[PDB]
């Protein structure tokens, strides 16, 4: 296999606190490589946070974070950590790790990104309502409503249905999130056979399947 | 002194 960088899960933190995301080189090493962290506020672009060479014990930090941010790595030297203290609402963003070979500049291996929400808003579980034509080809939907914080995950027949699906970016209202997904199939499919909507809110331990 | 991150072509 070729190295896969894997980050810890989405986090929620209240302003003033600290967050620490992990970056493990599943199937490889962080030694004599440049480990880099980069963030992205929603809708906006990439923001370098720092680089770190575990094998030289030297770091470089974006002036903007120097030094609320602290990039460390594990001995083994197989996992890298980013610790960002003094959290604020501004620091709500997806957080990526990546890895570049020494003295090259580029980073050719990226982690999968970890979401960090910085709010005082209480963790609320979603509510999942189905969408059907109550009243040639059929269009159905799930409605995942009034949850917090991001994110949720939504599947259709547990991924056995991926085409014809349109999952919509959540939106936030009255300090709460709402999200829809639509799936369209051939009319000889529903309700001849069943369609189930697979929703997941890790923040509230909420897993919910929904038939029809 | 940080030429451990990038080279100068």
């Amino acid at each position: 296999m070729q190295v896969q960088l894997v980050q810890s899960g989405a986090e929620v933190k209240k302003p003033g606190s600290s967050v620490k995301v992990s970056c493990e080189a599943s199937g490889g090493t962080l030694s004599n490589y440049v480990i880099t962290w980069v963030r992205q506020a929603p809708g906006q672009g990439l923001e370098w946070m720092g680089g770190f060479i575990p094998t030289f014990r030297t770091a470089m930090y974006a002036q903007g974070f120097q030094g609320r941010v602290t990039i460390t790595a594990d001995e083994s030297t197989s996992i890298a950590y980013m610790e960002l203290t003094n959290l604020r609402s501004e620091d709500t963003a997806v957080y990526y790790c990546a890895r570049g070979p020494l003295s090259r500049g580029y980073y050719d291996y990226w982690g999968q990104g970890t979401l960090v929400t910085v709010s005082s808003a209480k963790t609320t579980a979603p509510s999942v309502y189905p969408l059907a034509p109550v009243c040639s080809s059929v269009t159905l939907g799930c409605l995942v409503k009034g949850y917090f914080p991001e994110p949720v995950t939504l599947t259709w027949n547990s991924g056995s249905l991926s085409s014809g699906v349109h999952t919509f970016p959540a939106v936030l209202q009255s300090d709460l999130y709402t999200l829809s997904s639509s799936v369209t199939v051939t009319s000889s499919t529903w309700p001849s056979q069943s369609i189930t909507c697979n929703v997941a809110h890790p923040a509230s331990s909420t897993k919910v399947d929904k038939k029809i | 002194l940080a030429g451990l991150f990038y080279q100068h072509k």
Binding site: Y106, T139, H166, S182, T184 | -
Partner: protein
């Protein structure tokens, strides 16, 4: 500071070539790297050191950097190329990224597939009513939705969401949800969403009446 400049949008035809520019002062003296990022996904290295390509990256992707403009070139564009592109360099102990360039693929005009959905039985018991209008697989991007409760417009109450351009047929989707108190739902009858899209002079209407569902 050092400043990389990327155009916000670059739209090209299916099959033709896309060229994304990264401008900065004396940029040809720096080794320029390019990253592709699709919606939801992490960034992927597509070009490094101006012209070199990593593993797994199609030959169609090429780069050039001379003067004050690095250029990413994508040849024979497919919808599988729809993504944001970042240009990156080093300058004085710092990594600098450009603002995204969103590469959008042009295509045939398509009307929206509109589908309305009543509130759920389950939700109603909770005490709430939300009507959902799905406007799917249309092109160009711009669309307007009007929600009408008994032939009257409702402006407030609504929450809209638009997909990123579809990776498969280069189209757009919108979800619009009108959410109420249940008491409210029960005060009127017809619920209508009209879609105003360029493909037709006459808006598209999907409605229902409460006394029939």
């Amino acid at each position: 500071s050092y400043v990389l400049t990327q155009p916000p949008s670059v739209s090209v035809a299916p099959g033709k070539t896309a060229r994304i520019t990264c401008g900065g002062n004396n940029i040809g003296s720096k080794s320029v790297h390019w990253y592709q990022q699709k919606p939801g996904q992490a960034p992927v290295l597509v070009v490094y050191d101006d012209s070199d390509r990593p593993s797994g990256i199609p030959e169609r992707f090429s780069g050039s950097n001379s003067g004050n403009t690095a250029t990413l070139t994508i040849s024979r564009v497919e919808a599988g190329d729809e993504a944001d592109y970042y240009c990156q360099v080093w300058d004085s102990s710092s990594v600098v990224f450009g603002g995204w360039t969103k590469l959008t693929v042009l295509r045939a005009d398509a009307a929206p597939t509109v589908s309305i959905f009543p509130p759920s039985s389950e939700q109603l018991t909770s005490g709430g009513a939300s009507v959902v209008c799905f406007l799917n697989n249309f092109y160009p991007k711009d669309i307007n939705v009007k929600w009408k409760i008994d032939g009257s417009e409702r402006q407030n109450g609504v929450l809209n969401s638009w997909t990123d351009q579809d990776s498969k047929d280069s189209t757009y989707s919108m979800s619009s949800t009108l959410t109420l108190t249940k008491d409210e739902y029960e005060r009127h009858n017809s619920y209508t969403c009209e879609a105003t899209h360029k493909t037709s002079t006459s808006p598209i209407v999907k409605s229902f009446n409460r006394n029939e569902c």
